[PDB]
Subunit: 498 residues, 4 copies
């Protein structure tokens, strides 16, 4: 026959032998007699306002759409589980990790970054890979990308970054001057620019790309003891990338390529997994790391910070409803359960704010009650009330102020954050000048071959070629800074294009 | 001790000996260590952005308020049951009335009409008495008033109506120029104004007033035979109104008088009931009733159209949470299940549209998924999908187009509406010169005594007095028009004020 | 250099020599000192909550996206003028057509129909061609399509229609089972499907397609004499469609092809025009036209109803800001100023309600105050007040009730609608067995050549092939029903695919 | 005649001799023929969906209401100006203050705190007194109360505070156990509890109460030099309070008493003013102040910190439209122009967040474009775009990322915040135990007479009397702590009530 993606209504149906379709209602639950024909006066007369069946149905239609995500708008989702396989309770007291063999339920959204909802899957762009964990200590979202780094070290530049990757305010086209003005103007961006215009540019679907946490977390054990960390969840299926030729065909042949695959995998029983490691850096090594340990354009070398196994991530269940389980899934960085905790990373620090800020806009004040966003494996008791589209019992008749004499929830000191020490001037510290090439240099010299560097160049100018020549000049100079061959390999190409 | 409203937290607690308070969490379900102290650098330093407990709880606060009801904003609610006590099966094939002794669950909100949410209960104003029934044919909402009539016969004059009962666009004050300007310029308004300024303008609480459907519905039996009707739900508690001096006192002394009283009755075992009655009008009697049978400023005389008993309405359960079961209740008149159906009543035809329309504004697109507004005694199966705050499973992976070869829901013929014939010009018919006094005149000579007649006169004039003399002059003509003594009993008094 | 879309920022700048950049502010207008570095304690400390510049700008970001159009989501817009060139005053008393040479301002958005916002321009889909006119009798919106007909005759089947053109509720993929399931089960759908899979299914850009009002309007002259009509706005640029091979290429190569092209034409002085024409049908010819004159799956033959010229539509100004003048444009069909008026067209009667309904959802309650949607060539005076984002002075302190003794606005009789007589049963008339093939048959024998006939066949089958065989079987019967060779030219090909 | 509040439509009218009311339109700007009569078929037929005049009007009605403020919901507003009268440029470099005789425009909202929109003006409760300044350096809102202190020192307790002052979640009544549980449980609250149950409990309208900034600001001069400050704006009309007897009559006689007065003042030309002083505390005095200088329950003694004149606040213009100019006014603490700047005050620090957070909910993402909320006297240029109900030109075609090579706005280093030094552990520092009585003690002994203390007691128990006796016990103990007579004067009363 055909791929399971395609046999969907077929199976929905096959599955009800215990048929006799339900009665077609209105949302008030009144049964409908005719839904193919509006109520008029005379077969050729006008539409009656008493066709409250028309308006019901129509009123709902006209309301189906919610704003799509500010970035990362286009994606795939799926459910499965995390299971412990080694223990790191030395490092962390978090339940999710509390005992080898332990299994917590998880949801996952894969996506691109710049493209809007009708875009094509198979495009050069970073790639979200977000995991929500319904632990007992509440949800723990770990909002990762498929890259360990990023383009910038200060959240304040984010809007601008994102703006320049999207569309001209006047034109509504993608604009290379904007792409290339930004980037060449902020060279802290060359590390990930270098990752992206590489073969890892475009993965072969979600199942053949790694996931990272990117940021530096803080892990705290049962004694109050702290260490910094890095999360890496590697593909059990391997890497596998799509040539740029392959990628263009699929953009038109199957703009939704990655939903299809993800779907079909799981469905045919071919469950993707990933192995979660952690890098660990003590506070003192932190004090000596030749770079700012909390700098998104930076990786921790694994000769120095070898990886430590933690458990697996198994993807084994397809959404029944895309809208309700994928369009509406809300991942908040700030959903850190006792034992995990953010570091001083500038980028992390504004994600603390931004996520729940746009969820309250896109989904609504109470988006945490949407089925899939509910810490269901835990017990929410607090003094927050009311708000639009308030679903549950609103916590009934329970005292709503704190503190009170009437047995309402009470805080639990064991969940205090880790005491830590800060001394400084409240000022705005430059970061544009931290080291912008070193790590880039090596990447280019020792992590990637010769074809790979011949390609990474071709792809770079192949896009760059359409900025104005100044932007070109600036850009290559920067590239030139990281390694002189990086630069004149690119300048030569640019020449022949130009 | 005290009355039960007052002992609430005291009972909420007495009720948990299996205490040991729950753990206080964020909305993500993550446990909190200190909810009395924000997170800072040093005890006199600034507030960290990292205090994602502060922003969780505050973020929820700053978002607790939804718009109040455009009208009837202030109210009380409660749950109970409707119980069939006579059969009207000849008249209607509706499930709710299917067999003597049947009980259907019902919710009810009482409310006043023009005050905004912190106003006083005990003001002269009409009173809302809505009844939502959860039937097997979905919900059936009977958005009645405690008056059998109203001020107007065209929904088109409603906005205006209410605009003038509210406050001034410039001042935010209540204005008698606006009240009396409108009412005097539209004397169809005499019928209900006479009802409004008599003893029943101020019910002693909610329990001592009648509920009226006011509009003329149409009943359809199992043979396709329709008849016109009017619903009356009379109080088993008796009429009882508070003197205007009594009301002044309590408006200041206890703004919530009515809420307190309903809570307390039911809390102590004194459950209000109302007997539901129907007047019936054949299609024949209707081609001959001397007035528009469908005119909301008219009643059907009880010697002509005797009241027939239908069942009883008992209230026997208070809300746990007011916000979630009384503020979020949405009654839509268009929620009529098979055997109940709207008449050509111009005021009713406008209500068909407005209730859901504002419900999608106030509450949200999918406000019918609010536990309390859910037709939970029926099963919802349709082609409506998606939309903000989509709570259900959103009907899974079931075909969302109609018709379809795949066993998704089907319309049911036994639910077609009742066939009626209309002939005429598509035009806008005046209804301003429909008879404005007859019924009024009678009302004032034979319905109200002499005490009352002096009383309705003082009350009226006591408010009329503050308009501009032009306005009185015209207010009084109108009055003079229903009965010369009505007119001049009032002038008598207005001269003495003026 | 390059095409003008591409030189935008370059020109935005060349355009300010009176430079010296403005001071960068918050939204409160407070000047910013560093917008590249957030505020922290020490250079590696945490982010202060005090960085109210971070939260200002990020808070705005996280809130940039409004819902996209439920349909016709992807588009292009532009401004220009409509110019009377013949008089039709006999037919219509509308101000817009009042006198030869009159120019009224107009806006226009082109769009496709089923793709979401990042889709490709050049797909086979119908094409939207909306025209908003700013007349002295307020706005008049002509929400046309580039097709004179459509797929259905009852708005009630619309949700379904579109649900099946979109993607699967479970998969998020496009499904041929859904496409062909519906279309085969509703053959009224043959008329437009035949139009859709022929050469004109893919216009070469926006400039080379015709605009059609599709529905039958009704024109009312200054004597009260009405007539039925249809609007045709033909391209002065000529027809021109891209081969399906050409389209594949560009869907990948330039998703925005159409936007780019419209921008560029107008940018370079090549201003598109379309000639507007009206077919007229007396009320008489309508009691005898052999079909429902008001049936959207039918055209009025041009030998019977010749096209009469009305004026010209020129586009001659591009947007400054796309979000604000193209994404926020709201066209409502019900915006018809005196002398234009809806017919009993069941599809049109449903559109009367849906456009404003979704506009209040997407944009907001008061979306008609959006500069671009404002009837700026008229003066708005009514009793509507308040509501979210109320921008105007909200009509000051002017009486907000009607009627009133205080000189607030008054209704104007010369604007009453046109009197028509309707007689019949309030019922729901089938329209499914209205004639589904005649016009179709002709269309395929005499309207389309032999090349085209082979072509519309391959195209059709090329997509049909992916449905379940049942579905083809039935798809093909239908086809067989309009012409035996239509039916079997297709089977011929489907057998060879299958 | 009557008070100007009352002659409002009268004057609106009087004012158009240049009458002939405007034409009554629809919002699209189409003229209306009949607005008193819906469109039906037959004078007694049903409502046509083509009455797009009905739905327009009605659609808007149903949308008029926006959520009211979370607190401070009920109030009055007015416009006028601030003028400099002494100079403090030693202290501050802020333009508003830049030169004696200087005048900046201002808006003001007076309000209560707990009561919802229909509440009564004349009630014991603190009183908002908020001033918005349209300076050249953007707006400067100074969100003050009519008290120099507050009930709490940590924002985290705010929701809970507010909750307990409102209504029981179950009951919806005001609950003294909740009021008195909170307060007695958190004694840091006795300073302001002492202010509130005093004669300053209920002012005689807005014009006879002082305004304070309450919080501690930071003032920075042109050299980078800093000092801490306190803003006091004293009534030029004097104090004047309403006995509690007076206050109850007015609650029913004229729930809107304070709007009326405020209105009438200004209208009759009786412009209220207030004199703005500043207290100043150097950083070293800060280091030695026997208390936490940044503690809301604390005042700076004026023998020690005598007041320094700054300018006047003159109120001389009434709103033309309440909704648009008072309901929609948004005051943000965070609207601090270069020269003014927040201190480490815990309460201030969460107001930085909360205000704009709930404005984006209640009014909308773009509430800064609402006429009255617009920094109109300044020039907004930034990189923020889009968002719902986006009014202006959206900044046209101007580069939207930063930094860029194309002359888009640039930041201005002279607006850097003041460098300052913080050293600490990131922890949550208790504050419940800071001194809770001292200042209270003196208040009670030396700021208020003997009648005043006899009253302050009577009012206290007069309310307290309705909590349970435990709450009573706790409470008086606390009162007892501040001074033993405070306590047994209250216990005696409580006795006689109980
Ligand atoms: C953590 C401490 C506080 C928090 C979080 C807080 C929060 C809020 C909120 C959410 C509103 C509603 C605003 C709107 O919808 O536009 C509000 C209004 C207001 N607050 Fe507070 N409040 C705090 C303490 C105080 C204090 C100490 C004062 C006086 C110094 C004050 C003065 C006001 C005033 C006057 C308003 C009314 C705004 C208006 O009149 O438009 N707050 N506050």
């Amino acid at each position: 026959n055909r791929d399971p993606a395609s046999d969907q209504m077929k199976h929905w149906k096959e599955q009800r032998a215990a048929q006799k379709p339900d009665v077609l209602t209105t949302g008030g639950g009144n049964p409908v007699g005719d839904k193919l024909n509006s109520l008029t006066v005379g077969p050729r007369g006008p539409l009656l306002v008493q066709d409250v069946v028309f308006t019901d149905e129509m009123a709902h239609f006209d309301r189906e759409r919610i704003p799509e995500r500010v970035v990362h708008a286009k994606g795939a989702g799926a459910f499965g589980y995390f299971e412990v396989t080694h223990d790191i309770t030395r490092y962390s007291k978090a339940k999710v990790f509390e005992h080898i063999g332990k299994r917590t339920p998880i949801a996952v959204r894969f996506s691109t970054v710049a493209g809007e909802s009708g875009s094509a899957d198979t495009v050069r762009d970073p790639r979200g890979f977000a995991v929500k964990f319904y632990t007992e200590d509440g949800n723990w979202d770990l909002v990762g990308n498929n890259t360990p780094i990023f383009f910038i070290r200060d959240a304040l530049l984010f809007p601008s970054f994102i703006h320049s990757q999207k569309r001209n305010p006047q034109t509504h086209l993608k604009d290379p001057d904007m792409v290339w003005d930004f980037w060449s103007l902020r060279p802290e961006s060359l590390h990930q620019v270098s990752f992206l215009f590489s073969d890892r540019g475009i993965p072969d679907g979600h199942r053949h790309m790694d996931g990272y946490g990117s940021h530096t977390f803080k892990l705290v054990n049962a004694d109050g003891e702290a260490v910094y960390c890095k999360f890496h969840y590697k593909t059990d299926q391997g890497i596998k990338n799509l040539s740029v030729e392959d990628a263009a065909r699929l953009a038109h042949e199957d703009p939704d390529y990655g939903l299809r695959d993800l779907f079909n995998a799981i469905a045919t029983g071919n469950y993707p997994s990933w192995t979660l490691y952690i890098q660990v850096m003590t506070f003192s090594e932190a004090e000596i790391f030749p770079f700012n340990p909390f700098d998104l354009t930076k990786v921790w070398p694994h000769g120095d910070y070898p990886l430590i196994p933690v458990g697996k991530l198994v993807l084994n269940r397809n959404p029944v409803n895309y809208f309700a389980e994928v369009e509406q899934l809300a991942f908040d960085p700030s959903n850190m359960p006792p034992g995990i905790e953010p570091s001083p990373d500038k980028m992390l620090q504004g994600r603390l704010f931004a996520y729940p800020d746009t969820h309250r806009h896109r989904l609504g004040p109470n988006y945490l009650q949407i089925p899939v966003n509910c810490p269901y494996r835990a017990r929410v008791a607090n003094y927050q009330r009311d708000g639009p589209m308030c679903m549950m019992d609103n916590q009934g008749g329970a005292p709503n102020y704190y503190p009170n004499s009437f047995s309402a929830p009470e805080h639990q000191p064991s969940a205090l954050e880790h005491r830590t020490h800060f001394s400084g001037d409240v000022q705005r510290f430059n970061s544009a000048n931290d080291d912008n090439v070193t790590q880039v240099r090596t990447f280019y010299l020792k992590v990637l071959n010769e074809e790979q560097r011949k390609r990474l160049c071709e792809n770079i100018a192949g896009h760059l070629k359409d900025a104005q020549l100044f932007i070109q000049k600036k850009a290559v100079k920067n590239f030139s800074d990281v390694h002189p061959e990086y630069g004149s390999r690119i300048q030569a190409l640019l020449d022949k294009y130009n």
